[PDB]
Every structure is written in structure tokens, then in C-alpha cells.
């Protein structure tokens, strides 16, 4: 199926002394593969997956130079935005940037993206066509004008449709043993009595990859949303993911209820029942 490469960058200003805290992370699909943290000792881009260790010293020197350049743009941005919004030097502020590309089952370019936020609110984003910009307010509009005069969109489009796609394909090949492998959810169901009248059924999905999954309940063959609780999908810590969904039912009626699991690692969706 489809794949993605995405980079995420956060800078947080430190009023009173020194430069902002800067943290960069890179992902292929749901797998982290690189990081840079300005508070760490190395001041280098670091590997976070075994398959990226295949890359030579020139790659690591080049990514390091680029990630530091990213960090310096963010430092400057924090000063400019404080000016744009007439804010003081006292408070801590945040910039966030995300960019990357998607490819379909044929590993050809599908979509590209590049978005930016200031203090957790939309600031400016490249549109889907990769030709123009969405500016949220009048500050972002000034930036839009700057970037239009300098043809920034043109530079990004070239990266997102070219280099991004090229290197994602490269990563997918080098990391094929994990990156191109699906792990099906390991499912089971638990039971709790709340009182003499009421029971909780909880349907578990564990050890799955990628993160995308659907868990639903049915009663006598029809979808049930009322009296259900579905937790956010959460990392196990070993590269795989976890999720559950629970339903509250009248004691003795457990048999009416079935849990249904959809995941790319399952050719057929699966059904579970109590007892």
C-alpha cells in the first residue's frame, strides 16, 4: 500500500539566556529513523533505525549541516514573529514545522506538504497543488508576499516531488525487512463485573504495525457506539502499537456483542466474542 516520509521540528525560545531548544525527528511511515536535539552532546544528526546506519559519513555530515540550518531559521523566525505580534521578551514561544511526501502502492509521488505553526496555531502552509500558500492572518500574509517574491514554493515543489520521493524509495528498499512488513494485531477480550447488573467487555489489539486500525462493537449484528469507550492508539515502545475498545452491557447478555478488527495485516477482518 501507500508510504510516507515526514519530518517534524519544534523550537522553544528560552528568555533570559541563549538560543532556543530545538528538536528534529524524521519518520518513514510510523517508524522513527533520525533525530537531532540541541541539548544533546553530539551536535549531530543521529540514527534511530538500524537500516539508516547503512548510510555513509557524507550522508551524516550533510544531514547535520542541513538540520543546523533548519535550527537557525527557527531561531530567526522566533525573533521575527515576536515582532509581528508585538510581544515582549519575557515569555517563551514555540514554532512547529512539518513537511514530507506520500507515495501510493506504486511508490510514485501522490501528495506533498509543508506547514508551520506559531504558539500552536496555524501560521502558513503550502497548498495541495504545491504552487501557493494559505496564510491564516495578516502576519502570515506578509510572509506569503516575501515567499512569493522569492519563489520558495517552486523550491519546495522540486524537493517534495523529487528528492523526497527518491529517498523514501531508497529507505523502503534498505529497510524492507521491517518497513515493508505488516504485523497483525494480537487480539483478546477481557470481562469485568461492575455490579450485579452491569458488565464491561474490553476488546484488545496488541503488537500491530502500522498504527492505523479500526476496532468496533456490534450488538446482535448492528453497530453500537452508545456505552462504548475507545482509547487513543498508543506506542508499545518496541516499534509496535496498542489499542482497545470497551462496551458496557447487562450481565448475562455478553453473547449479543461482538468485536470487529480491521488492519492491513489481516486479509480478512476478524471477529471476537466473550466465552
Amino acid at each position: 500500500g501507500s508510504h510516507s516520509m515526514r519530518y517534524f521540528f519544534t523550537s522553544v525560545s528560552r528568555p533570559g539566556r541563549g538560543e532556543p531548544r530545538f528538536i528534529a525527528v524524521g519518520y518513514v511511515d510510523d517508524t522513527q529513523f533520525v533525530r537531532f536535539d540541541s541539548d544533546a552532546a553530539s551536535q549531530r544528526m543521529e540514527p534511530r533505525a538500524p537500516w539508516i546506519e547503512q548510510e555513509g559519513p557524507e550522508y551524516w555530515d550533510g544531514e547535520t549541516r542541513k538540520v543546523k540550518a533548519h535550527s537557525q531559521t527557527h531561531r530567526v523566525d522566533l525573533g521575527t514573529l515576536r515582532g509581528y505580534y508585538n510581544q515582549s521578551e519575557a515569555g517563551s514561544h514555540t514554532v512547529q514545522r512539518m513537511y514530507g511526501c506520500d507515495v501510493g502502492s506504486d511508490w510514485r509521488f501522490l501528495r506533498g506538504y509543508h506547514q508551520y505553526a506559531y504558539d500552536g496555531k496555524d501560521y502558513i502552509a503550502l497548498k495541495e497543488d504545491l504552487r501557493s500558500w494559505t496564510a491564516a492572518d495578516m502576519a502570515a500574509q506578509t510572509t506569503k508576499h516575501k515567499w512569493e517574491a522569492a519563489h520558495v514554493a517552486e523550491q519546495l515543489r522540486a524537493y517534495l516531488e523529487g528528492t523526497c520521493v527518491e529517498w523514501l524509495r531508497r529507505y523502503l528498499e534498505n529497510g524492507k525487512e521491517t518497513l515493508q512488513r505488516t504485523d497483525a494485531p494480537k487480539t483478546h477480550m477481557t470481562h469485568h463485573a461492575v455490579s450485579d447488573h452491569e458488565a464491561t467487555l474490553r476488546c484488545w489489539a496488541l503488537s500491530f504495525y502500522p498504527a492505523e486500525i479500526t476496532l468496533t462493537w456490534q450488538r446482535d449484528g448492528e453497530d453500537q457506539t452508545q456505552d462504548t469507550e475507545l482509547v487513543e492508539t498508543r506506542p508499545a515502545g518496541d516499534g509496535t502499537f496498542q489499542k482497545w475498545v470497551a462496551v458496557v452491557v447487562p450481565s448475562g447478555q455478553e453473547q449479543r456483542y461482538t468485536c470487529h478488527v480491521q488492519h492491513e495485516g489481516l486479509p480478512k477482518p476478524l471477529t471476537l466474542r466473550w466465552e
Binding site: 519530518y7 531559521t73 513537511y99 528528492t163
Partner: peptide
């Protein structure tokens, strides 16, 4: 592989 240039706001 990171983008080679990042424009400031």
C-alpha cells in the same frame, strides 16, 4: 533526506 534550504518568515 532533509530539504537543502529553509526560508525565514
Amino acid at each position: 533526506n532533509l530539504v537543502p534550504q529553509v526560508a525565514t518568515v
